Every structure is written in C-alpha cells, then in structure tokens.
Amino acid sequence: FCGSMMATGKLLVSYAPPGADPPKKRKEAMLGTHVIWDIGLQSSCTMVVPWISNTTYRLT
Amino acid sequence: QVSSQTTINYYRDSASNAADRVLQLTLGNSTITAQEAANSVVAYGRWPEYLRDSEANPVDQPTEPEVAACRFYTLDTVSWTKESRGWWWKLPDALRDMGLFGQNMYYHYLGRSGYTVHVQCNASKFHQGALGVFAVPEMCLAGDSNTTTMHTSYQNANPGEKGGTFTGTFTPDNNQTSPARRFCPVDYLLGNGTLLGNAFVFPHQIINLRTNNCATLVLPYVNSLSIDSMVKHNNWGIAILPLAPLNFASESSPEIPITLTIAPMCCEFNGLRNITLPRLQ
Amino acid sequence: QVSSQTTINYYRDSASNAADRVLQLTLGNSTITAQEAANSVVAYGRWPEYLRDSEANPVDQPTEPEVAACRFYTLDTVSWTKESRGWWWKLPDALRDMGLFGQNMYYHYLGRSGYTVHVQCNASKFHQGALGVFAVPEMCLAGDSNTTTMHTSYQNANPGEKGGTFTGTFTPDNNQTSPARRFCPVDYLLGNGTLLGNAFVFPHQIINLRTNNCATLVLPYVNSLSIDSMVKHNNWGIAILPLAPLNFASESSPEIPITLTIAPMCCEFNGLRNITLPRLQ
Amino acid sequence: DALPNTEASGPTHSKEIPALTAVETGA
C-alpha cells in the first residue's frame, strides 16, 4: 500500500477456485479463500494461493 | 452428623432436606487479521466444545460440518451516522442464509454451536466515538403493543442478517386492527427493560476509536438444554450500541461503517429430515 | 546386468530404457434391507477410501460431510414395461439436487466420492424377466448428429435424477438449423459403440426375477486424478438394460417399477467458494 | 529431489501474524 501514513483501512483479497461464477461482489468472494488486509502500519500483505487442482500439473 | 457453626435427615427424598493489539485468527478457509484489536473475550471463560457423551441427550450420530460451516461469514455493513442508536443481530438466526451452515441448520432438527464474533470498525486518529458490543444470552426484546404481551411474530423477531435497530423513544403500535407484532426496543433500556449501564454484566467489549478498531468475542454454547432446535431458539444475541456519539472535525455528517464477521465453532447437528422452509416475509 | 532368457542402460532418462440372499446395510441415518439380494459386487475389489496424503494433490483442508452426505438417496422410480430398452444415470450428476450432497458438490470446487448403488425391483414367482445393471466407468455416449462429433450440450448430457433412456434404433438429428445436441445411444450397442454382450467386463450384476430382486454395487472412486471437479466430470455411470423382456401370465401389458438407492461413501471435498449455479434447462 | 512436503495445519489464534510483512526491505 503506497499511500500516506494517515490513510487507514482494510481490504479483502480473495482467491476463488474455478468452476463457478467469477466473484463480482464481496458477498461471493468471501466464500472462497480470503485474507483481510489491515492497512494500519505494515504496508504489505501476502496471500498464499494454495495448490488446488484436479490434475497434478496445469498447462501454461 | 454434628456440623460446625446436629443435622439428621428424616426424609428419603433429597428435596426434603434443609438448606494485545495484534491479532490473527484462522477458522477453516477463512482468516481474520487486526493490528489494533484489544485482545479477545472468552465469554464466561468457556471455549466452545463438542458435545460430550457424559451429557448427551439424543442418540443419533451427530453431523459436524467442521470446515464447511466453521467459517467466518461477514454480515452486511451498517453506517454509524451521528444519530444512530444501535443494532442487534440474533444468532444463529443471522447465519441462516450463509453458506452451508444455513443448509445444515435447516435440514437438521437439533443443533448446537458456539460462535466467534469479530466486530470491525476503523476510524482515523481525528475521529471521536465509542461502541459497546454485548453478547446478550437469551436476548429477549420488548414488544410494541401495550394491549398485548409476547405478541411479536416469527418474521419480525428474526430479521436475519439485516439485523435490527434500537429506537430512541418508545412508540406504541396503536393499530388495533392489524398489529405490526414488531419489536420496539428502547435504546437505553436495551430492549429487555433493564438499564444500559448494567448491560456490562453480559460478555462485552468496547470499540473505542482512539484505542482499538476491533472487538473479538468467543461465545460458548449456553442453554438450558445440551442441544436445541436452531430454527426456534436463538441462543445468543449481539447488541452494538454507541456509548459516545460519533464526531469528526466539527462536521455534522460523519459516517463510518461497522461490519460483523461471525464464525460458528464446534457446531454439531442431529435429526436429519425434510428441509425446513419457514415463512419469513 | 546379465538377465536370464547383457542389459546395459546407456541413457540417464528412464523413458530411454528398453521394454447370500439376505442383506442389510446401514449408511448414516439410512438403512437398506433385502431378503433376496444375491450378495454384493465390490467393483474392482476396492472399497471406497478417503484420500491418502501419500497421493494428495491439493493442500486445502478437506471437508468430509460424513453422515450428512453419505446417506441412501432413493432416485425416482421407472416403469419396466415390456417394450422398454433401458435406462442410464450418470454419477454424481444424479445426486446434484439430493440433500446436502448436492450443496457440498456445488459449493466445493473439487470433490471425490465412492458410491453404493442398490437397484431394487421385485416381482412375483409368476413373473419372467431379467435386468442387467452395469457400473460403466467414464461412461460416454454417442451423439445424435452424424454431421458433428462431441456436440452434445451440458443440459442434455446431465439429465439429473430423471436419468436417460436407450433407444431401440438410431435416428440422426437431421435438423441442421438448431441441432438438439442430445444423446442417442442405441440399446444393444450400449451407446458407446461397443456391444452389449461384452458389457459384462464392467462391474455388473443381474436382477433375475426368478432368483433375486436386488443388486448391490460398491463402486470405488476411479479417475485419472486423485480429486476432480464433480460438476464437470461424471466418474461412473449406471446402465440398467433388460436382458430378457418382462412377461407375466400371457399378459401383454405387464409393468413393474425399478428403483435406485445411491449412497455416497467416503466423499471428500476441497476448494470452497461461491456456489455453482449451472444452466440445466 | 523431493520438494518439501506440505505439512498439515489447523485453526490458530496466535499473534505472530506471519501473513503481514513489509516489502520495503529487499527480502
């Protein structure tokens, strides 16, 4: 978060595996994997997108 | 038996005898973080636990969803304008159309569950206010009609995730033809008829915008019964009331949003059957 | 290495090297009984098992419904008139609107599960007929259009619990404007294009009305992948074809009903998210 | 070489907050 020091807030970073409607509102995104990022002091947040796959590998 | 300061029992039956800021918590696939949360309240100092057979009334094998239902659902957000008196959400009635927990509670007859409620509200250093979040057990609320008692309807007493609101002043439902059968809880009386000041006896936290922006409550399962119907009985109830009104830079229209994130914990169910399809509107 | 009838490997990569009647079974809150069921078939001699970490592709914690989804759901009943050629239900596509299993498979991205299929059809000692129930793995079926290949639509290839039927004779979908994109599997070819007689290579049982009135099949989870999407890939497929036509007391209109009762076993899910709302009609 | 095994994990309530970091450093 490259913003001012007095800018505080929160964000939701969501990963939703495939096979359904892509998220378009916070209502649907939370149901998948999600992380709530607080922008208070630390400027960074990490979302580890896990390995969910039917195949052992994915085509590029 | 000569007791200290001759006690002889003459009747077989016993009744006849004489007389800190940082927090990050993960539930299932959901994670919550808060860098300025002022610790957590384990309501009544009891962590939620699965039903123990030593105190198990029903026999049927219990279905525990585990990860699929013990997740953090974020209920809708509500604006904390200056002239707002409070809000109240009954549980588990709030999580009735939330993911698979709603499906499980509607399908299964009996169900028990603890909760983890995270109330989130953040404001700048220049904002001024304070919320109080109380987890009222068996939270009842007063009706709107002085001509009848206990007349509230199921639809109006279970708003869902939308929640309810506290009204500044009482107003009788004078309509005698088609009574609204609607809650009218006065803000300072807390609805039950008690006083707000004493409401701190309940498990509670305070979200003081100068100090903390979050409030975590781990509510165990309290009930006269080990397991009880979830569609009828609402065990707990969250009431958020602003102890001190919002204020900001002498501005007469300051708004900030308040969000709730509730996670069922150690939720167990019994008695599967046709799915309840209640009338709510 | 001097092997018996000098084998030296020159290339590091390995690819470069040279070359009984009585039965009663309980799943969850469901129980099935059959006094004249001719034992069970553990398809391929493998009982369904939970995913073992030694062969686990995804990392996410799996949600196993256990009792809430490993129940016996009775699909609709079908009349076995004299001039009926067969029926076919694809799994788990059949259990898509059955209790909480449908909800779990729609909510979760990946899902694996075995099944226990109990086919029930009872007739008097004076009835004459015989069914064959085959659990076809990866059951494909031929299309109806000779002008296109693999043109069937999702809606028509996944009938649901209603199932499908085998047609006596092939009939091309001559409509070139709006092709029906609908399966047209010939009964004796089994749909795939093979022959019915050889279809006994698949796991199978025979419901011979003189001997037995039930057929139990324990189908494990067979798939190229340890876990795979349940809304796209239909692992197994049940095909019921009457080997010998129904007959009764020289009566030309004999009907008896056939019922299916499918119980998911050791069903596991991963990848929770917004709920799939597919187009089916 | 066999890549690291994906070890098991469960619900946690600690304050280590490994998720949040600072990219300002070069690590």
HEC string of chain B? Answer: CCCCCCCCCCCCCHHHCCCCCCEEEEECCEEEEECCEEEEEEHHHCCCCCCCHHHCCCCCCCECCHHHCCCCEECCCEECCCCCCCEEEECCHHHHCCHHHHHHHHHEEEEEEEEEEEEECCCCCCEEEEEEEEECCCCCCCCCCCCCCCCCCHHHHCCCCCCEECECCCCCCCCCCCCCCCCCCECCCCCCCCCCHHHHHCCEEEEECCCCCEEEEEECCCCCCCCEECCCCCCCEEEEEEEEEEEECCECCCCCEEEEEEEEEEEEEEEECCCCCCCCC
In chain B, the residue whose alpha carbon lies closest to the alpha carbon of D15 is: B23
In the stretch 1-60 of chain A, residues with CB closer than 8 A to chain C read 16-21, 23, 28-29, 31-33, 50-56
Residue C109 and residue C233 in contact, taking contact as beta carbons nearer than 8 Å: no
- Within an 8 Å CB–CB cutoff, is residue B124 touching chain A? yes
Asked if C272 and A20 come within 8 Å (Cβ–Cβ), the reply is no
In the stretch 92-121 of chain B, residues with CB closer than 8 A to chain A read 99, 120
Pairing mode, if any, of strands C257-272 and C108-120? antiparallel
Going by C-alpha positions, the residue among B54, B25, B44, B73 that lies closest to residue B267 is B73
Give D20→chain A minimum CA distance, Å. Answer: 5
Please state, in angstroms and rounded to a whole number, the distance separating the CA atoms of residues B272 and C66: 13
Strands (E), chain C: 23-27, 30-34, 37-42, 73-74, 78-79, 87-90, 108-120, 127-135, 164-165, 204-208, 214-219, 228-229, 237-248, 257-272
Interface-testing mutation among D5, D6, D17, D23, with chain A (most A C-beta atoms within 10 A)? D23
Return the H-helix or E-strand segment holding A48.
none
Q: Tell me which chain D residues have a C-beta less than 8 angstroms from the C-beta of C59.
A: 6
Interface-testing mutation among A5, A15, A30, A52, with chain B (most B C-beta atoms within 10 A)? A30
- Which residues, in sequence order, are bridge partners of residue B262? B73, B117
Query: What tokens does C114 get?
Result: 């075995």
In chain C, the residue whose alpha carbon lies closest to the alpha carbon of A52 is: C58
Residue B3 and residue B92 in contact, taking contact as beta carbons nearer than 8 Å: no
Pairing mode, if any, of strands B237-248 and C164-165? unpaired
In chain A, the residue whose alpha carbon lies closest to the alpha carbon of D21 is: A44
In chain A, the residue whose alpha carbon lies closest to the alpha carbon of B68 is: A31
- Within an 8 Å CB–CB cutoff, is residue C8 touching chain D? no
Q: Please note each residue after which chain B is broken, C-to-N distance over 2.5 A, or write none.
A: 5, 19
How big is the A-D interface in CB pairs under 8 Å?
21
Experimental method: cryo-EM
Pairing mode, if any, of strands B237-248 and B127-135? antiparallel
Which of B29, B72, B124 is facing A8, going by the closest CB pair?
Answer: B124
Which of B26, B33, B40 is facing D11, going by the closest CB pair?
Answer: B26
In chain A, the residue whose alpha carbon lies closest to the alpha carbon of D20 is: A45
Residue B130 and residue B242 in contact, taking contact as beta carbons nearer than 8 Å: yes
Return the H-helix or E-strand segment holding A33.
strand A33-38
Asked if C67 and B62 come within 8 Å (Cβ–Cβ), the reply is yes
Count Cα neighbours of C152 within 13 Å in the Cβ-side half-sphere.
Answer: 17
For residue B179, give the amino acid letter: P
Q: Tell me which chain A residues have a C-beta less than 8 angstroms from the C-beta of C58.
A: 50-53
Query: What tokens does B121 get?
Result: 């509200």
- Tally Cβ neighbours within 10 Å of residue C252: 8
